Design a protein around this ligand. Structure first.
Ligand SMILES: CCCCCCCCCCCCO[C@@H]1O[C@H](CO)[C@@H](O[C@H]2O[C@H](CO)[C@@H](O)[C@H](O)[C@H]2O)[C@H](O)[C@H]1O
Ligand SMILES: CCCCCCCCCCCC
Ligand SMILES: CCCCCCCCCC
Ligand SMILES: CCCCCCCC
Ligand SMILES: CCCCCC
Lengths: 127, 451
């Protein structure tokens, strides 16, 4: 019912970060977990998710870069973010809905993490 | 208001039904999530389980009347049921136990079910006016237990796992037994004739032997639904042949086929309507988040509210006809909610499902509350066996029908599942409306035959 997100942070363009979502009392195994993100001045948008039985869903602009996966031993869901780009900068939230569906809007999900800042800098080393 | 044994029976039935509906509410999800069945496998296996649970009820009344006694068979049934619930809880350690465990619940239910009502019937002098009220309260007792179980068992299963949920089903039976034993003193002169002679150990052994054989046969049939199909087909065609060879029974037959349609629809609540709630309904009502599996509790909820009112408030074939129109409207409401009142993300308001369940429960109060009760007004043993058989066939058919809504585990978009549910629920509602119309047309002829 309360999800703990961890693993945000600051990274340079082209880098990687891993987010993790863990639940307290309820076993996360019965939940589709969707990752949402809110960039400055826009609404929360669905990024990626996994349902209770390994079905996956992705926003178009993150295919081939993000992977959602689930560790049913640790009762944790992970969002592995590779080839990061500045416009991936946002507050990221995990959200959980019972069952096999990953609806696209925040209103489809009852349980929400608090949000983790992810920042991707255009920083590159000097040539 | 009522004799003292009424209250014992009220609470024994409440707790037994709590155990049973604790299982029913979570079983299809248990199949899908815990055993990894596809939704199709889960739906047909649930249909087979429910078919056995219902078809075997005929045995326990005979055992109570003629072999061991009503009160003795209450004790035996409760013990076998508790064993079954604890075995289901053990099946999480030993998955290979699951079917045997379900078979034990089925047989325990078969031994138990008819006997509390029979006992309650003997708590009143023969034309006591309070009987009607007492049996309505008896029905509410069933639905109070069911309401609690269907509400809470998914929540418990989510927070503590299936082992705890099933052990709590067992515990509910244990306390049913304890209240019976503690109040055993209230029913000293109440029972069937074998209750008052010493127990025949010959007959007890025949009942235990047959029970164990039946537990294994049930396990096999639930594991192999494709031959459970042929068993019930040949049994149905054969008992149909022998009913047709042997005009008030004609009324019993036609009402029985209509009841078949009703039970086919009732079977959707733990399967296709359950997964429709999971996949295409918002999981929040009046601002509270809920487990969508708990939506099944709307059936006993509405029954609990409506049974007094409708007890306070044509005759036989028309009451059946009205119930069929109600069921039709329940499924047409489900289809309409999905076709026209869903979100852009494919989710519909839970108030639509509240109303679906109201319609289905009114159908129940008109049909099944009043089925073999006034099929008993048209009639013997052959028709009791055939009644429970046909209702078993209905549950197998209901599982098959539910498979048309089965969703592969890789689908995650509600807009893909919504048209499957709406197409199937709409077709169910239209077929049931047609059945209701043919029923309406025959109501006058039926009502003549009953004279
Ligand atoms: C329409 C029938 C309604 C059924 C009534 C539910 C019984 C009350 C639940 C027990 C006490 C409440 O305990 C808890 O409350 C919160 C919010 O209220 C609910 O919600 C929490 O648990 C459930 C299942 O575990 C999750 O699917 C849910 O999204 C989560 O947020 C649950 O329903 C219940 O786990
Ligand atoms: C009321 C007396 C209790 C009788 C219980 C006897 C059980 C016999 C066990 C037979 C094993 C197959
Ligand atoms: C190897 C697992 C076999 C499980 C069979 C369980 C039977 C237990 C009877 C109580
Ligand atoms: C009232 C005694 C009931 C005996 C049933 C026990 C069968 C094992
Ligand atoms: C009584 C109807 C049976 C249908 C089997 C396909």
């Amino acid at each position: 019912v309360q999800l703990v997100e961890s693993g945000g942070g600051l990274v340079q363009a082209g880098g990687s970060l891993r987010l993790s979502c863990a639940a307290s009392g309820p076993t996360l195994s019965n939940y589709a977990v969707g990752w949402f993100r809110q960039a400055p001045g826009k609404e929360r948008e669905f990024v990626a998710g996994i349902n209770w039985s390994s079905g996956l869903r992705y926003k178009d602009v993150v295919k081939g870069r993000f992977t959602v996966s689930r560790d049913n031993v640790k009762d944790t869901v992970y969002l592995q973010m590779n080839s990061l780009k500045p416009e991936d900068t946002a507050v990221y939230y995990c959200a959980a809905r019972f069952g096999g569906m990953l609806p696209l809007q925040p209103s489809g999900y009852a349980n929400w993490g608090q949000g983790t800042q992810v920042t991707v800098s255009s920083h590159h080393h000097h040539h | 208001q009522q004799p003292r044994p009424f209250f014992m029976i009220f609470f024994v039935e409440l707790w037994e039904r709590f155990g049973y509906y604790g299982v029913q509410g979570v079983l299809a999800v248990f199949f899908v999530k815990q055993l990894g069945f596809s939704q199709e496998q889960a739906f047909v296996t649930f249909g087979a389980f429910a078919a056995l649970v219902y078809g075997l009820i005929s045995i326990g009344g005979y055992v109570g009347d003629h072999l061991l006694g009503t009160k003795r068979t209450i004790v035996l049934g409760a013990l076998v049921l508790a064993i079954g619930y604890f075995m289901t809880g053990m099946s999480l350690l030993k998955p290979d136990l699951i079917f045997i465990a379900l078979g034990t619940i089925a047989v325990g239910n078969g031994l138990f079910k008819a006997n509390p009502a029979s006992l309650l019937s003997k708590c009143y002098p023969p034309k006591d006016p309070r009987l009607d009220g007492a049996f309505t309260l008896f029905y509410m007792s069933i639905n109070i237990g069911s309401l609690i179980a269907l509400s809470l068992a998914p929540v418990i299963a989510d927070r503590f796992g299936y082992s705890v949920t099933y052990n709590l089903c067992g515990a509910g039976l244990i306390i049913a037994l304890l209240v019976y034993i503690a109040c055993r003193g209230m029913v000293k002169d109440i029972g069937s004739e074998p209750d008052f002679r010493p127990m025949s150990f010959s007959k007890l052994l025949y009942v235990l032997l047959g029970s164990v054989v039946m537990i294994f046969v049930c396990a096999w049939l639930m594991h192999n639904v494709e031959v459970a199909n042929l068993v019930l087909i040949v049994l149905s065609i054969v008992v149909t042949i022998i009913f047709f060879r042997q005009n008030k029974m004609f009324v019993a037959f036609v009402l029985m086929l209509e009841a078949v349609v009703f039970y086919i629809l009732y079977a959707q609540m733990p399967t296709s309507l359950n997964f429709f709630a999971i996949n295409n309904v918002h999981h929040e009502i009046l601002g509270f988040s809920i487990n969508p599996v708990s939506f099944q509790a709307l059936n006993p909820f509405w029954v609990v509210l409506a049974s007094p009112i409708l007890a306070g408030i044509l005759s036989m074939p028309m009451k059946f006809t009205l119930g069929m129109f109600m069921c039709s409207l329940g499924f047409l409401t489900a289809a309409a909610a999905g076709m026209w009142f869903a979100d852009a993300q494919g989710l519909t308001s839970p108030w639509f499902i509240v109303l679906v369940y109201l319609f289905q429960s009114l159908g129940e109060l008109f049909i099944s509350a009043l089925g073999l009760a006034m099929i008993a007004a048209l009639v013997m043993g052959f028709i009791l066996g055939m009644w429970f058989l046909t209702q078993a066939a209905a549950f197998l058919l209901g599982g098959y029908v539910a498979t048309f809504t089965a969703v592969p585990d890789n689908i995650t978009d509600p807009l893909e599942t919504l048209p499957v549910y709406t197409n199937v629920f709409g077709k169910i509602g239209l077929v049931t409306l047609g059945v209701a119309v043919v029923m309406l047309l025959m109501v006058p002829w039926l009502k003549r035959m009953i004279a």
